[PDB]
Amino acid sequence: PRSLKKGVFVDDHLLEKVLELNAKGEKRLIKTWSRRSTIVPEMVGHTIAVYNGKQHVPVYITENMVGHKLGEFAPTRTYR
Amino acid sequence: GKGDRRTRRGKIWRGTYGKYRPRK
Amino acid sequence: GNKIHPIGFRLGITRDWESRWYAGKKQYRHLLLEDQRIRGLLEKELYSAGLARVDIERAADNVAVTVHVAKPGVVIGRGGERIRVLREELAKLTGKNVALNVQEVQNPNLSAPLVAQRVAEQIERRFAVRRAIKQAVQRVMESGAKGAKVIVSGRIGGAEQARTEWAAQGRVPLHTLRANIDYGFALARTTYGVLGVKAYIFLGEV
């Protein structure tokens, strides 16, 4: 079960910081405290930095890792 | 039984409108 | 942990509302904040004379108001000196034809609300704690009155251990749902910590 409706959401303020990055090659990592944004295709290899709540961690995202949102990778708690 | 869902008595207790429960 | 407001268990009977009007959904929800400004304003200063009970009877746009005072003379001035200064500045935030009316408060010693501030005052003027209290009932019981009461509190006389003095006299049919009983609570800031007395006042009967 998923949900977004008619018109997918993605914070339109990290995109310019992306469709531009691979618009002339690539980069080495992006930094934006936004996980509310969907993961999209070209974001391949980009390697983003989504927040945790303190620390910051990598995301060598891929297509299979698309239908999923950026935040679907921010491990908050800490079990065991 | 209530909380069952997909059945009249599901959209009774919970009270909703889906398929199993239309508008006559 | 028991007993509630005296006028409260009355309102609908023997003691009308302050803002005694009527509104509706798209209204009221501010016809009260603004009606409480009839308080914060037409009472923030009269105190030194009345502050009795500013019940309003507005009726669409227009407003009847009424701001009672036991000292009808400190409300006016030179035939109407202070019945302006802010009497219009009463509208300097809410004009809406909101006026002003005052009446003859017959005996401040039959208006505990005052009697309280009275104590409060005498509680600030450091007056003898209980005495002015036993005087309270008197002054009051004297004014044709019936019952009384004065229930100060907290570290009386600036004392340490927080206590709460008594004092009142003949007839306090609080439970009686039909006595013209009055209330009126006074606070009184404090160089050692706030106090505040209640002061009740039974009156008439039916």
């Binding site: - | - | 509302w17 009527y22 409480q36």
Partner: protein, 60 residues
């Protein structure tokens, strides 16, 4: 009713879904009855006299 938190008087959030009612007199943040703008607290001791007409010790 903490002014550093009563600024909501902005009704100028950034995203409409952010106006936290607040009591008109008590301030707090919750229980803040919409019809009377204030709180559930006040309301009681309040209406108890007349700052709230139409009211009445709801018996029955």
């Amino acid at each position: 009713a903490r002014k550093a938190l009563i600024e909501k008087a902005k009704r100028t959030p950034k995203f409409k879904v952010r106006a936290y009612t607040r009591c008109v007199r008590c301030g707090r943040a919750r229980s803040v009855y919409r019809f009377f703008g204030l709180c559930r607290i006040c309301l009681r001791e309040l209406a108890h006299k007349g700052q709230l007409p139409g009211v009445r010790k709801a018996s029955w």
